[PDB]
Amino acid sequence: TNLCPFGEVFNATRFASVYAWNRKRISNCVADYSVLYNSASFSTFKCYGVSPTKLNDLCFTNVYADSFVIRGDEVRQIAPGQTGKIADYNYKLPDDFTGCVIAWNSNNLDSKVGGNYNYLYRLFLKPFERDISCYFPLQSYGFQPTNGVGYQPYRVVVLSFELLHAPATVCG
Numbered sequence: 001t002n003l004c005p006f007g008e009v010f011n012a013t014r015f016a017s018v019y020a021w022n023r024k025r026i027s028n029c030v031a032d033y034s035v036l037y038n039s040a041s042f043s044t045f046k047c048y049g050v051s052p053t054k055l056n057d058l059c060f061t062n063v064y065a066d067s068f069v070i071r072g073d074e075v076r077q078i079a080p081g082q083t084g085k086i087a088d089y090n091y092k093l094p095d096d097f098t099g100c101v102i103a104w105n106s107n108n109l110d111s112k113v114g115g116n117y118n119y120l121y122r123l124f125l126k127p128f129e130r131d132i133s134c135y136f137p138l139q140s141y142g143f144q145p146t147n148g149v150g151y152q153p154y155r156v157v158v159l160s161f162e163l164l165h166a167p168a169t170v171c172g
Helices: 073-077 085-089
Strands: 022-026 044-047 062-070 100-105 120-122 138-140 154-162
Touching: 062 073, 073 085, 085 120
Parallel strands: none
Antiparallel strands: 022 062, 044 100, 062 154, 100 154, 120 138
């Protein structure tokens, strides 16, 4: 009864840029979701399609966990059926969304005094596109603890749940 390894998913020291977002497939383990509901420390807990307390009693063939870091104000840009900077250039999301969205503060880790220029965004998609490639069309965020709330570095993970013709691999 090996757990699904979410300690390196949530408590990774370095995530990725939003144009190179880290997707990790999760299969063949047991996963606990109610402790992620009752962690009581996430600035954004939103679960689409299905309630998070009842997710512990469900089974899924494949999970895709997508991880990136965005600004403050555009946590509201994570929805299906909308427009936005992330929604057009960085991470577009399909309208049939049964996965769930967790975001939290990372001013403590993803920013520092004097500027954090770690992360990169497409300043110049279809759903689930990771776009790799006279200006260069990309820019870098400027991250300070003295930056504003909408300027704050937040970490976002997105859980995509799939049922296929395979037998079920991830349960609770």
